[PDB]
UniProtKB/Swiss-Prot annotation, chain A:
TM spans (from-to): 16-36, 53-73
Natural source organism: Salmonella typhimurium (strain LT2 / SGSC1412 / ATCC 700720)
Function, as annotated: Involved in a secretory pathway responsible for the surface presentation of determinants needed for the entry of Salmonella species into mammalian cells.
Localisation: Cell membrane
Protein name: Surface presentation of antigens protein SpaQ
Curated annotation (Swiss-Prot), chains B, H:
Keywords tagged on the record: Cell membrane, Membrane, Transmembrane, Transmembrane helix, Virulence
Organism superkingdom: Bacteria
Listed name of the protein: Protein PrgH
Gene: prgH
Complete-protein stretch covered: 171 to 392 of 392
Location of the protein in the cell: Cell membrane
Keyword RNA-binding: no
UniProtKB/Swiss-Prot annotation, chain C:
Segment of the intact protein contained: 32 to 94 of 562
Protein family (similarity comment): Belongs to the bacterial secretin family. T3SS SctC subfamily.
Coiled coil feature spans: none
Annotated gene: sctC1
Species whose genome carries this gene: Salmonella typhimurium (strain LT2 / SGSC1412 / ATCC 700720)
Superkingdom, taxonomy of origin: Bacteria
Name under which the protein is recorded: SPI-1 type 3 secretion system secretin
Biological role stated in the UniProt entry: Component of the type III secretion system (T3SS), also called injectisome, which is used to inject bacterial effector proteins into eukaryotic host cells. Forms a ring-shaped multimeric structure with an apparent central pore in the outer membrane.
Curated annotation (Swiss-Prot), chains D, E, F, G:
The family this protein is said to belong to: Belongs to the YscJ lipoprotein family.
Localization: Cell outer membrane
Gene: prgK
Residues of the full protein shown: 20 to 203 of 252
The entry's keywords: Cell outer membrane, Lipoprotein, Membrane, Palmitate, Protein transport, Signal, Transmembrane, Transmembrane helix, Transport, Virulence
GO process annotations (BP): protein secretion
Recorded GO CC terms: cell outer membrane
Bilayer topology: Lipid-anchor
Identification of the protein by name: Lipoprotein PrgK
Cited function: Required for invasion of epithelial cells. Could be involved in protein secretion.
Native source organism of the sequence: Salmonella typhimurium (strain LT2 / SGSC1412 / ATCC 700720)
Length: 84, 222, 63, 184, 184, 184, 184, 222, 221
């Protein structure tokens, strides 16, 4: 069951690396909203969720060509491991 | 400081013999005491010259000279129990030199060993050398196969032997090589995988017939 | 001279090579086309080689 | 005194010293405290001492057991790493029971490890054993080969007498006298 | 006094010295504390010392075991890594046990590695062993190939006597005298 | 004294010197701390020393092993990389065991990497080996080619005696004398 | 004294010098610390040195390997990248093990890259090799071509003796004398 | 500084011959020792004129001259076991030169080599040159095929050879070419696979290849 | 600084012979003592001339000289057990030189070795050279195949030999090449895998091998 234990670690290692990039870009600019306003505060709580959504779909527009091919390769690899 | 004081406290395992070519021969008895006495002369705590001799290494030394100056000679072993008068076990039924040629051979062997005084040449028999190997190989109850041919015999022991017949064949062979040497009779202990220990029969129309000894063995389904 | 070198043939492609030295065409059945043969063969007496090979292989023939 | 080994421990230094004293050279053990032991020989005995260090592969490596590759304080414990840890303590316990016979100085036992015999549908194979021993001299060592084969036979599930191999041997000659200081 | 190797290890410098002293040149082993050892030779035998460095491929590299490629401190562990870290401990435990026979100075054992037999539907293959040895001289080294083969035969599942190959030899001539300083 | 190589390594500088001293020109190795060694030759030997640098392709590259391309320090590893690291550890262990025979100075073993057997339904293929060796001169090296073939045969699963190719050769003539400085 | 190249590497500067000394013009190598090297020639030897720079395409590019196009820093690895990084390491280990033969100065091996068979449903093709070599002169280079084929035949799975092509030659005439300064 | 001291410490691996054209020839023995004494004379630490000579290069130098001034000559090798009197091996059963023409050949070959004194021409037989090659090729148990033709023979060693019949043939061809030369008899160690690899064929004067159970092919008569 | 003290402490393994061309010869007996004694004369701690001779490299040098001035000669070895009087083992049944040409050969061989007083040329029989190679090979229980031909014999050892047999063959070949040399009788050990391990076969006149229940193999004799 080497291919079974390899496809399970590859599936969870690809979950950690695909869901970690827009999560860190969702909190780099989330920290650059709160740390920037230490002078001339004017703080409102619901304000950074719009910029965080624009920052998420911005980096998804960059990594859309890479997120597809890292799933296209693992998808073609996991069926070839099953059939042949 | 003399040489017999520079060795160990037990002054009974080494025997110092004065040579004839102005040297001094230390006579050990095995390979551990040979390196014990060679380390003394190697580090150099002795001002004269000294050599260490043996019974094996002084028996492969004067056989190299002998298959150049006296080829086609039949002999067994040189015994060094008394190191000042060695015994040369010569074969009887395979040589043709007379009494005058044996004095020349006993003088040219005396000149090779300067620590000796006179080499004694005794003509041992040739059928008791194989009789003492077969009666001793039959006493331990080992499955053997004798192969007589011209100028030497050969005993072969094959099969899937157990640990008792391996320890007994090693114990007898090493006690026979020390007396006669491997010049006439040779032993052939080899381990294959067949429950028949060497022998092989073929079955047809009357019973079994004993086959001749060949190279191929039939593997055992068992 | 002549001869056939079979390397894992199938007793139909082997016996058709002997169909020139034997001056008749050979017809091999279906169950006798499952056994195989290999080795260098030489054809200088094919009537005695067919009678000896049909007994070492186990075969019957009829002309 | 020319040093040749340093930073050893207690069990390694007593083997390098015991090897060199058999070949007529004397060594000196020096405790450097926290760093470890050390061994020094003389200068005429230095060229000969490096030759026996190279020959006997000294200092000795620690003896490896199969239960070290699968430690007990790991996270995962597979069934292969559980039967490989059980069979290693069995051959470590049978050796200590072999040293308690009458006239045995050392022994080593090897059990046939089976790995994929359990996870397939096939039943596991029989068990094969092997043992070495070093006896005290003066004993008729051909006859004590049928007591190790009797003690090892029904200590397992099912073995035959053709599947146990005992290879034993008498010990070497005793070394009791001093090497001797190199005079010049 | 010209250095040719520096920053060496303890057991590496004892091998470079034991190689150079065999060919009538004398080396000097100098420590440096944390920087390791260093080896210098004399001036008129510097060209020969460079030639015997190149010929014998000195300084040596550490010995390779199969269990160094699949370390035990990894987070994941495939059944191929557990099956090869287990063959790699019997491979170097039979080597440790071959050194305790009467006459053996060094030995080396190799086992055939079969990994994918339990993965797919094939039956497992037979086991093949191979061994080397260096015996003390003065021994009948043709009658000692059936005791190593008997000891190696039933330490595994099922091997034959046609799958064990022992290639052994006697050691070289002893080097005991000092090389000698170059006079000029 | 013009320089021709600098920033070298301790292993590389001992090989450039051994190449230059073979062709009757003298070089000088100079340490420079953590910046490596440097090699300087005389003035009239400069035209020949660049020619043997270009011909012998000096300085040497580090020797490449297959296990360097697939590091074990990665988090997740394919079975195509674990089987390729296993065969590269066997290939180095047989090479380090061939240098311990009687008369072998250097050796090199290659092995077939059957890496696409488990991907499809075809059975795996047989394995092939190929070895080189450099023997000490004075030996009739025609009969030494069957000992290496018998040692390598049943050290694997199932090889044949015509799937092994051994190409071995005696060593070159020794270089023991100094090159000699040119007079001016 | 007009300069023609600057900012060169050490390995490139030794090859530009080794080319200009073959054609009777004298060059000088100037070290500039961090900025590299510089090759300066004399005044009448400038119109010829600029001709041999254009002819021999100097300075030389670094030699390309296939394992540089697929680095190990990628988080994911396709099977084509893994089989190309494996073949690109056997392709360098075979040419590092061809230079250790008797008489070979340099060598160069090429393996056929088959990539699509391990992922499609198609059977794999055979594997082809091709080697070059440069021999020391005075060699029977027709008889020395039948052991390079024997060495390369069974280092892979199944090649034939017509799928290997060896094109080897001998080295050029030695350049030993100095070029000579331009007098006027 | 003398040339005998400008070389290495071992004053036996080279040999200095005073030439006739006011020069000084150094006689090396192989190619590793040729470049050792060519570096000395090329880096300029000697005053007069000197040259380094070999045996293979000097055998290839005065064979170019015998392709221009004496074409269609049958010879084997020029031996330099003592460099002052070389021995010229000429073919006996393929020449038509008289006593005077062998003298003018010796006087024209003496002027090419200024270090020699008198070239000695001896006539070697022609059937012994192929008899020693066939009797040496049969002792090593090598398969071969002899092709006699006019003015030379040819030995063809082909097939799929193993590793021991390569090493046992490379040591014989190198030991035969050194003493007889590669002018008359030539060996062909052509290592190749089996032609018609796994194809069943019907050899002899009307031949075909079976590419498949249902495919025939009719090339040249196999 | 005499030469016998510049070597090692043990003054037994070397033997310094004075030469006729005013040169000293050091006679080692293997390659390790040869490189031990050549390192001394190569590093330069001896003023006069000296050379290091050996058993083998002197036996391959007067065989390079011999097949140029004396071709078509049948000989075996040159034995150096006493280096001031070597023994030249010539053949008897393969050359017809007279008593004068054997004295000319015994003077031209003396002039090549300046440490030798005389050369003892002894003729030897040619039947016992092959009888001692066959009676020693039958004793070790080895399979062989004799190939007699004109001017040399050849023994071929084939099969799938085990580890005991490939060590008993190598110790006999190495112990026979020392005495006689590889000039007349040549050994050839080649080993190959056995085709018939689990196969059923018929042997005798009409022999065949069954590679399967439905597969026959007819080997050509």
């Amino acid at each position: 069951m080497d291919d079974l234990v390899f496809a399970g670690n590859k599936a969870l290692y690809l979950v950690l690396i695909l869901s970690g990039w827009p999560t860190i870009v969702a909190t780099i600019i989330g920290l650059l909203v709160g740390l920037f306003q230490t002078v001339t505060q004017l703080q409102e709580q619901t304000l950074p969720f719009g910029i965080k959504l624009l920052g998420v779909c911005l980096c998804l527009f960059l990594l859309s060509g890479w997120y597809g091919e890292v799933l296209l390769s693992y998808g073609r690899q996991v069926i070839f491991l099953a059939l042949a | 400081a003399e040489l017999d004081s520079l060795l160990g406290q037990e002054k009974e395992r080494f025997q110092v013999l004065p040579g004839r070519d102005k040297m001094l021969y230390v006579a050990a008895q095995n390979e551990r005491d040979t390196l014990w006495a060679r380390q003394v002369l190697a580090r150099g705590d002795y001002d004269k010259n000294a050599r260490v001799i043996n019974e094996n290494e002084e028996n492969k030394r004067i056989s190299i000279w002998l298959d150049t100056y006296y080829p086609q000679l039949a002999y067994y072993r040189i015994h060094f129990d008394e190191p000042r008068k060695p015994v040369f076990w010569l074969s009887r039924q395979r040589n043709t030199m007379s009494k005058k040629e044996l004095e020349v051979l006993s003088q040219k062997l005396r000149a090779l060993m300067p620590y000796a005084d006179s080499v004694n040449i005794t003509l041992m028999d040739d059928v008791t050398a194989a009789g003492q190997a077969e009666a001793g190989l039959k006493q331990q109850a080992l499955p053997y196969s004798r192969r007589n041919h011209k100028g030497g015999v050969t005993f072969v022991i094959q099969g899937a032997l157990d640990d008792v017949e391996i320890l007994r064949a090693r114990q007898f062979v090493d006690s026979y090589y020390r007396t006669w040497g491997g010049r006439y009779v040779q032993f052939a202990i080899e381990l294959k995988d067949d429950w028949l220990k060497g022998r092989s029969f073929q079955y047809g129309a009357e019973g079994y017939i004993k086959m001749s000894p060949g190279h191929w063995y039939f593997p055992s389904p068992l | 001279g002549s001869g056939f070198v079979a390397k894992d043939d199938s007793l139909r492609t082997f016996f058709d090579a002997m169909a020139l030295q034997l001056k008749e065409p050979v017809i091999v059945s279906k169950m006798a086309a499952r056994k195989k043969i290999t080795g260098n063969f030489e054809f200088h007496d094919p009537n005695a080689l067919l009678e000896k090979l049909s007994l070492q292989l186990g075969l019957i023939w009829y002309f | 005194d020319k040093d040749l080994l340093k930073g050893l421990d207690q069990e390694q230094a007593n083997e390098v010293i015991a090897v060199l004293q058999m070949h007529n050279i004397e060594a000196n053990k020096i405790d450097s405290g926290k760093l470890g032991y050390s061994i020094t020989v003389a200068e005429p005995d230095f060229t000969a001492a490096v030759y026996w260090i190279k020959t006997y592969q000294l200092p000795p490596r620690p003896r490896v057991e199969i239960a070290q590759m699968f430690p007990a304080d790991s996270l995962v414990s597979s069934p292969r790493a559980e039967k490989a840890r059980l069979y290693s303590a069995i051959e470590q316990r049978l050796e200590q029971s072999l040293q308690t016979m009458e006239g045995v100085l050392s022994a080593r036992v090897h059990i046939s490890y089976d790995i994929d015999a359990g996870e397939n549908g096939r039943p596991p194979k029989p068990v094969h054993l092997s043992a070495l021993a070093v006896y005290e001299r003066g004993s008729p060592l051909a006859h004590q080969i049928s007591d190790i084969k009797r003690f090892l036979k029904n200590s397992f599930a099912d073995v035959d007498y053709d599947n146990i191999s005992v290879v034993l041997s008498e010990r070497s000659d005793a070394q009791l006298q001093a090497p001797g200081t190199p005079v010049k």
